[PDB]
Every structure is written in C-alpha cells, then in structure tokens.
C-alpha cells in the first residue's frame, strides 16, 4: 500500500479502498 498526500476526493480514493465500499463518513469535522 502507498503512503500518499491526499485532499478531499483523493483522500476518499484511499478511504473507499481502505473501507472497501462497506461504508464511511469523509466529513472533515463532526459539528
């Protein structure tokens, strides 16, 4: 797996792979 710099859509491109489309919340802050 690659250690990489990622903002928004790129960060979700790791998130979506790491969570394997099972599910996640990419929101930067809760409130």
């Amino acid at each position: 797996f690659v250690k990489q710099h990622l903002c928004g859509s790129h960060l979700v491109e790791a998130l979506y792979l790491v969570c394997g489309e099972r599910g996640f919340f990419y929101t930067p802050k809760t409130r």
Binding site: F1, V2, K3, Q4, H5, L6, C7, G8, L11, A14, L15, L17, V18, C19, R22, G23, F24, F25, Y26, P28, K29
Partner: peptide, 22 residues
C-alpha cells in the same frame, strides 16, 4: 479532522481505516 493530516502529510490504511463506519 484526518484531512488536516492526510492532505498536508502522508496517509495509508493505518490512518484511513479510522473513517469507516462498517
């Protein structure tokens, strides 16, 4: 937020698997 770490520095499953809800 994790974005503040991942967009400025470097991330992998070791950081991102904290976002998953499932």
């Amino acid at each position: 937020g994790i974005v503040e770490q991942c967009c400025t520095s470097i991330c992998s499953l070791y950081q991102l698997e904290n976002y998953c809800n499932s």
